[PDB]
Ligand binder design. Structure first.
Ligand SMILES: O=[N+]([O-])c1ccc(O[C@@H]2O[C@H](CO)[C@@H](O)[C@H](O)[C@H]2F)c([N+](=O)[O-])c1
Ligand SMILES: O=[N+]([O-])c1ccc(O[C@@H]2O[C@H](CO)[C@@H](O)[C@H](O)[C@H]2F)c([N+](=O)[O-])c1
Ligand SMILES: O=[N+]([O-])c1ccc(O[C@@H]2O[C@H](CO)[C@@H](O)[C@H](O)[C@H]2F)c([N+](=O)[O-])c1
Ligand SMILES: O=[N+]([O-])c1ccc(O[C@@H]2O[C@H](CO)[C@@H](O)[C@H](O)[C@H]2F)c([N+](=O)[O-])c1
Ligand SMILES: *[C@H]1O[C@H](CO)[C@@H](O)[C@H](O)[C@H]1F
Ligand SMILES: *[C@H]1O[C@H](CO)[C@@H](O)[C@H](O)[C@H]1F
Ligand SMILES: *[C@H]1O[C@H](CO)[C@@H](O)[C@H](O)[C@H]1F
Ligand SMILES: *[C@H]1O[C@H](CO)[C@@H](O)[C@H](O)[C@H]1F
Lengths: 447, 447, 447, 447
């Protein structure tokens, strides 16, 4: 079947600073909570870390030349906060700013629109030392960071995102302890989530006050769970799973309150949202779009022993990618329609991709399963657009094989293979497949 | 995840006469419409036919020994009508009856319950010569065939099905011309469908009058289509696709009328159901269960040019089996719940399986994709039972690689590989996987 | 180096009933706790069980022909208690006795000395229903079982063992829950251990009173741990690890008391040995030899969080077999010298072998790592004999690939490969290597 | 298990001049006894020699760039005596000095601490012509060589070793004839050993008098033998084996006498140590640390026919590296504790590695057995540190595949593969494994 995309559909790829850049000590870069985390034995597989990574601090010109031949129109990347403010400090590091000017000017030179993520998880350790996100002073620190970027790159960047995946920053990181700073305390995860939201609202307010160029949003990762039974309990468990990812952050922003179930759920667990006067108004600051990050879908049932959400995922026997995630693309269609409760808002898919670990064989990377994955999910994108939803663009995750957080370098998401021994880039078969789709601006599924 | 099945859950496998038996001219067997069809150039791939097939006319003792070591409780097979009545004639062939007594006694000897399909597509050619199913005299001919079987095998067979897949017999065979007798006429397909239904009702009536042992039903193949858009037209197109397979046959049987939309749809195309006084009452004869035959699911949209149902299937990019069908097991869960409109009736899954063409390599058939397929679909079966639906059993399609109708021998569905050059059986890896599940009476999905 | 063994050194192989026999419901066999355990979802990998196994209930004549061409002098096997007393009942099953007469007469016919293990873990479920080993009535039940065997096979069997691996029966099974009946209660594991010992003493007493032919002992599995540090705590942790396997059972038998440290350790955990008047005298019944079961060695340190013995094993980086055990044969030499605290007693190595999962390739099983393993351990055997220790024989574990308890059939220990789909035996390369050693009665290590 | 190393633990790699440098005739280099030896038919396998080798005389900048990306803190190398004094002559060769200034300045430029071995076996042939090490005039010649180096490289080198492996220089070379100059005379081996020791003491005395920068020691290779029996004779044989490597050189240095047993043993063989007045005082000159060179461990027994030490090694069946040595890392732990008889002295492991002959395949060297070897031995290092022993650093043997003395180029020890046809370096998989360990400063053993 032929799937023709809109003329002005925005095709891109996405990375994050700590996952690709390397040069973790170079040019006065301070340490982030992820440096600290990855430098701690037992936290990241094999003790991998983002010292070096893809060395994109030095190799960005090649990366941009490769993405320019991909025929892509955006590039989503994030800013290393501790390159700009090494202690989250108000003491600016000009060399850090100079790096992003080099990147952004190259992008703009190549007709590729920067899509800037300000926060992709690298809180300066200095700020974490004071309580980092659980401390409201970090709010003010973020707003200065954001403001500095808005002022420096005014007119060079037209698409901004405050935070990438608040659910991970808050709950995966501070309740489940899986990501830096690796805490396991409900109240702290709720505190972090709330303060992210206030810092987000204040940054969007500053954006507006400054008259900064472009449009600004936030990029939640988005859950989809479907009940095993037709029971009310299984239905409830899926609602909790879905809502904590998206609604818990999106209902404040759009509708001015946290999801009351969940507030009630967490209250049963003795945790309350630290809401201060004025906070909810700040958080409801109008935004221009959202980014949605999507990989997977699950079938869940109520289980009292299944974690703090008491929602158990059933292994339905589906095939899985090389990191263990089932592929079921309908979940993207379902959650995009779900999110229309907030209106027909502008949505960019700011992360979608698969861990497929194929290496270079006879000079190429025959990653047919990544093509298959992307094909399936791009059909759903077309499908939602054709239902009239304002889905504006799609960013493949990831340009490059990179540091996959707690999995280290073992789990490859790139459309370009990186040999971490040599730093040699080898575009995979999915890169050429994707080059054709973005260039043609249509997709064909064939037998 | 562990999926524990009911204590009295009925595990089996399924074949059909013309697909396995061979000996097509032996012991006075008359020709069927499928002999004729497969003997016609251009109808079946490579000119394959069911002369010989798996030679199960001669090798049934081995087949039963193999299925007995599978640990199975039923075996679904069909009766070759032209072995019993070579001209559909009232002139019985005792040698034909003797074959099925040999099979049935062996099954019963082995503690394996016969599950008898009377009609699995092999209408005597003699009857087709007079109009075959479009001629009401074929109704009377079928009822005598059914009656003969009820009388002969009374007390040896406790599970009966009148017809396997009426949609195929009627629409695939007489509208789309794909299966014998290969006609392309809407009115004839509707005539055939109606007369099958009357012949079904009359046979169930005779069953009851005779006091034959056991329970009797009918085994539709079951469609599931889900709309591409949220549009009313796409929704309509899926409704037509779903209903022609199941409702068109099941609404007469259960509720006493054909689906009125569809009646109206076909009337626009100038075809009317040849309903005679008393017909609908006959068809509404109470039955004890149904068999459901399921493989696949589709995403459809309205398309004026997409065949007589104007319903186009979208290639969504899903992986497909070796015959080209996508695997999406949720469709089984969905259609089973759909069918509850007729009440919580007893349902056996009387056909589910995958075309996976792996051959013997180092003495085994490493058909991991067939295991994967079956795993997925057995989860859904468990899922519906746990929703309280009366799903009573599951028959894997197929015991043996066999004659796959218009595809010939090219398309292998068996859990046991058959080398058609030698007739050597080699149980595939899925056979041993299935032996464990049926024996344990639980399934585990693992990473 | 050449290693010449004593003229009268006893070479053999070893199996256990539930691991090889199959026919779990045949001839009135009752269910054991391992039938129950393996039939419980989640207990054994893949839901494997010992229904069928190697089908040695039917195929014992082939097995004996194969072991007879191995040139072996003993065969260690165990008696399925529930074949003899299906409810542990006093109601004898003659068909069960007849099986072991068939096996034993064949062995004796072939000049192969039976080495009979009475208890290799298959307690009748009927007895477990009353508390099984935690209930002193099971003591009396075992003594009748033992007595029945002594009386029936008097003069046909000259080597007897009461219990195989008391540590597993007691602590692995009732404290760690890993083996049937899968309990996790210190007091119950101590109760079980104590009652095994009383049942052992009473059986040896009956043996003597009856004048039964031959010699009788018990076959502990034997731990060896060596401390990571030179610290007193690490030394203590290794002492606990070593002593619970051997001394906890051997000090009662030889010296008339339980190891006082350990008694004190378990008392801190609120568990006491249920010692009744007369018990310790019973347990100290003189025995003729012991069997030692050995696989592996560990380097341990004190760790408060490392289980009920607070003894942590360090992964020292050694290569491991396919079940994950490091090979360090010196541990056999060390523990044999350790056990001289009980005097220079007669010791048979009644189990030593490796899980090496090589399959049949070009008609053979090239299990070089199993040869390597056995070579290393047979050097140590020679080494202890040459130090003057009365090590009398060696039984390779196992004749056949078999049901490896909680690992199921996945973990192969056999010197003969069994295809569980066909039951075809294929002697591995280690079988022919071993045939040469036992026949020559010397070993050569070569570069 | 995680094994965290001390913050200031010194990671390195090690080479020797004649094994890597090549340019054997360049820049006025005189011939050494190893040039002569390797140029003699029958002495070195295949007639390989150290003309050319790794050509590190020319390629040192690449080697240093590679070791700098390894993240290493030291580099142990040796000085070619005949580059500096071609006839061992007092006539200095400035071009020879200039080479080591180029190397050392590059190392220092790269933040890599030189660890200088003065004598790694390349005695000028001119000196051997006069009796070479058996002649006391060679003592004086060495002290001038050492003094020249101390004076030239003062302040550029902070770690010095006088002699690498005195046991090899003396006994392997002059008793067993295996290494240059290939003599077989006990008295000459004892003479050589004694004179090495005097030359060592005098050089350390000069070091002190000059006020040279850094610390100075000597680097014995270290034997470990464990007795086959518990017999006094086997115990004696192991004591001789252990002591001739270490104690025979270390007891003079630390305690002021040769091991009296051994003195007595050699006296029975008619050889006496040529001790002159003042000699033992000279040899007892205080040193700052020792280097320990370790590969392997053995199980030995007394055998009258087993060489001049009458100590036979038993092939215990252990797997071996590609040069034929068994790997048993506990020997490192054992001998380090053994050496505490001299006090808790500072010990660097100045050579540990494995001959693993894997070549480049698909662009990499998959030397998993070298990683396994190093893993095992680094656990023991951690283990001794944690026992409180002052083990200060670890140098992998070897940076590069090189000339392995009598084995020639056939036996590869490198962490970087060298194609001797092209001189192309290819870092092996162990190089990247090691880069991670040294950089993280911890090791993890995993299943
Ligand atoms: O420059 N400033 O003085 C300043 C102060 C507080 C600022 O922000 C304030 O920071 C507090 C924590 O210190 C938070 O509790 C308040 O919610 C936030 F409005 C900002 N800002 O966000 O733009 C700026
Ligand atoms: O034996 N008979 O005389 C006889 C006749 C008509 C019979 O059946 C009749 O057959 C007609 C066609 O010939 C159909 O039109 C009728 O619907 C059917 F009742 C049956 N029967 O179905 O049992 C039996
Ligand atoms: O036949 N009998 O009457 C009989 C009774 C108790 C017997 O044994 C007794 O059994 C008791 C449990 O019922 C245990 O508490 C005693 O320790 C045991 F001596 C035996 N026996 O072991 O030979 C035989
Ligand atoms: O420069 N010198 O005149 C000189 C002489 C002898 C020297 O050393 C002497 O050499 C003798 C052999 O010629 C040895 O027998 C003596 O043991 C050694 F002290 C040294 N030195 O070692 O520094 C220097
Ligand atoms: C979205 O998911 C990918 C894959 O897990 C991560 O690598 C990104 O950092 C995250 F934003
Ligand atoms: C159900 O489907 C299978 C596969 O197409 C056919 O072979 C059977 O005959 C049909 F009843
Ligand atoms: C000794 O160990 C082996 C291997 O785990 C088991 O299979 C035997 O049953 C046990 F007695
Ligand atoms: C230590 O051993 C290695 C391997 O045999 C040699 O190559 C070195 O030169 C020696 F110092």
């Amino acid at each position: 079947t032929i799937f023709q995309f809109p003329q002005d559909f925005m095709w891109g790829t996405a990375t994050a600073a700590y996952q690709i850049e390397g040069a973790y000590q170079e040019d006065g870069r301070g340490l982030s909570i992820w440096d600290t985390f990855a430098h701690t034995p037992g936290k990241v597989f094999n003790g991998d870390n983002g010292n070096v990574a893809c060395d994109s601090y030095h190799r960005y010109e090649e990366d941009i030349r490769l993405m320019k031949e991909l025929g892509i129109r955006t590039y989503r990347f994030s800013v290393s906060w501790p390159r700009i403010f090494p202690n989250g400090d108000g003491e600016v590091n000009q060399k850090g700013l100079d790096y992003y000017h080099r990147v952004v000017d190259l992008l703009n030179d190549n007709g590729i629109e920067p899509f800037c993520t300000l926060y992709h998880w690298d809180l300066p350790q200095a700020l974490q030392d004071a309580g980092g996100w659980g401390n409201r002073r970090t709010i003010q620190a973020f707003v200065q960071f954001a403001e500095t970027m808005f002022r420096e790159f005014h007119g060079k960047i037209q698409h901004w995102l405050t935070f990438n995946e608040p659910w991970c920053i808050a709950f995966l990181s501070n309740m489940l302890g899986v990501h830096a700073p690796g805490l396991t305390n409900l109240q702290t995860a709720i505190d972090v989530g709330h303060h992210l939201l206030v810092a987000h609202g204040l940054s969007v307010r500053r954006f507006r006050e400054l008259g900064t160029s472009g449009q600004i949003g936030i990029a939640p990762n988005v859950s989809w769970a479907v009940p095993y039974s037709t029971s009310e309990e299984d239905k409830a468990a899926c609602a909790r799973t879905i809502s904590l990812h998206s609604d818990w952050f999106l209902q404040p922003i759009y509708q001015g309150s946290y999801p009351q179930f969940l507030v009630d759920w967490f209250a049963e667990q003795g945790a309350t949202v630290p809401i201060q006067d004025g906070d909810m108004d700040i958080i409801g600051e109008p935004i221009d779009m959202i980014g949605i990050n999507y990989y997977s879908m699950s079938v869940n049932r109520f289980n009292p022993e299944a974690g703090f959400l008491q929602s158990e995922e059933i292994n339905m026997g589906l095939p899985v990618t090389d990191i263990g995630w089932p592929v079921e693309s309908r979940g993207l269609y379902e959650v995009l329609h779900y999110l229309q409760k907030y209106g027909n808002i502008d949505i960019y898919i700011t992360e979608n991709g698969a861990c497929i670990n194929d290496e270079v064989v006879n000079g190429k990377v025959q990653d047919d399963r990544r093509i298959s994955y992307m094909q399936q999910h791009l059909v759903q994108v077309h499908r939602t657009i054709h239902d009239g939803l304002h889905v504006k663009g799609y960013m493949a995750w990831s340009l490059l094989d990179n540091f996959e957080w707690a999995e280290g370098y073992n789990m490859r998401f790139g459309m370009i293979h990186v040999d971490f021994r040599t730093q040699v880039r080898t575009p995979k078969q999915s890169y050429y497949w994707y080059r054709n789709v973005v260039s043609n601006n249509w997709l064909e599924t064939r037998r």
